[PDB]
């Protein structure tokens, strides 16, 4: 999951030079800067609140698969906190499933792929 994270963050860091000055950039560059900001706000973690491996995997899968694009930047941290409350309460089984098979060579199996995109879609539909 984190390879796309690293690539997108690196390219956002590269394009920050244009983001600082240029306002005539195409919609592709604007959306890409927006995605970089989404990831950076995702990494803004508070203190004394560690996230287990399954939770980080779920959040990064949600963010890197365009499920977070419509969320405005200032509310992404609240979105992540609410999503973690959702998984901890509404669907503990998806967290158990993610943590159970985190070692397989191909992690995004359709089985893990379902019931996770479903959870993200349910959370998106219910709130905002």
């Amino acid at each position: 999951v984190a390879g796309k994270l690293k690539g997108e963050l690196a390219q956002f860091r590269d394009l920050a030079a244009f983001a600082q000055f240029a306002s005539d950039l195409d919609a592709t560059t604007k959306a890409q800067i927006e995605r970089g900001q989404r990831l950076q706000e995702l990494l803004k973690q508070p203190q004394y609140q560690p996230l287990p491996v399954e939770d980080q995997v779920a959040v990064l899968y949600a963010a890197t698969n365009n499920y977070l694009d419509d969320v405005p930047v200032p509310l992404i941290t609240k979105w992540r906190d609410d999503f973690l409350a959702f998984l901890r309460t509404a669907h503990p089984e998806v967290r158990k499933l993610i943590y159970d098979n985190r070692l397989d060579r191909k992690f995004p199996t359709p089985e893990v792929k379902e019931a996770l995109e479903a959870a993200i879609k349910e959370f998106k539909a219910t709130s905002n």
């Binding site: 690539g7 244009f18 240029a22 950039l25 195409d26």
Partner: protein, 232 residues
């Protein structure tokens, strides 16, 4: 290595972090009571480097080729240790993260990888000519990338489109299969002599590489292999 060199066999000697050898010399001198030189380094820096690097030479009976790795503290090339190391160098190879992450496994940057053998009087006129035609279209590091970035390629760049295509083709073609990675990536390794390299790149710069799309120069040994892949 010198035993086998005296036996007449060519030897490839790898020294990992020769800068750590310099640092060890500096610590030994500091503990031995010698006064420091420059930034705390040993007074006998040049002689200590000479007593080791001068044994790496090609005599008549045999040769010891060396491929060392150099770590510069911070990014300071003015530091005495990298300067003394570089005073005993014949070529530099700069592996690059960007080339490695672009699936091109040999990450040797075409630029920032110099050599003092790259002159007509040793390699040959053709080798120097072909090595100068290449790395010239890349001399800009494809500085055209910025104009594409802020112009959408301007929908037309005339020659620049051809030079960009050729530069991308060469960058892809620099990759070569690894006989040691054959059991990992499942591809036989191809050994390419220098004559094959110069002929292949001469033909590619002449234009025989045109009319062939990318992903066909990605991972192959020779230009003949690329042609065989294209026709098949």
């Amino acid at each position: 290595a010198e035993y086998f060199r005296d036996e007449g066999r060519d030897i490839l000697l790898f020294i990992d972090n020769i800068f750590r050898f310099v640092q060890a010399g500096s610590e030994v001198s500091s503990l031995l009571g010698r006064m420091p030189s420059q930034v705390g380094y040993q007074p006998t820096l040049g002689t200590e480097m000479g007593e080791l690097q001068e044994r790496i030479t090609s005599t008549k009976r045999g040769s010891i080729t060396s491929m060392q790795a150099v770590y510069v503290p911070a990014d300071d090339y003015t530091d005495p240790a990298p300067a003394t190391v570089f005073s005993h160098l014949d070529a530099t190879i700069s592996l690059e993260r960007s080339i490695a992450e672009r699936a091109i496994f040999p990450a040797v940057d075409p630029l920032a990888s110099t050599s003092r053998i790259l002159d007509p009087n040793i390699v040959g006129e053709e080798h120097y000519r072909v090595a100068q035609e290449v790395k010239r279209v890349l001399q800009r590091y494809k500085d055209l990338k910025d104009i594409i970035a802020i112009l959408g390629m301007e929908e037309l760049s005339d020659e620049d489109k051809l030079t960009v295509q050729r530069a991308r083709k060469i960058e892809l073609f620099f990759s070569q299969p690894f006989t040691v990675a054959q059991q990992f990536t499942g591809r036989p390794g191809k050994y390419v002599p220098v004559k094959k390299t110069v002929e292949s790149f001469a033909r590619l710069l002449n234009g025989e590489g045109d009319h062939i799309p990318e992903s066909f120069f990605y991972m192959q040994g020779d230009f003949d292999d690329v042609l065989a892949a294209y026709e098949a």
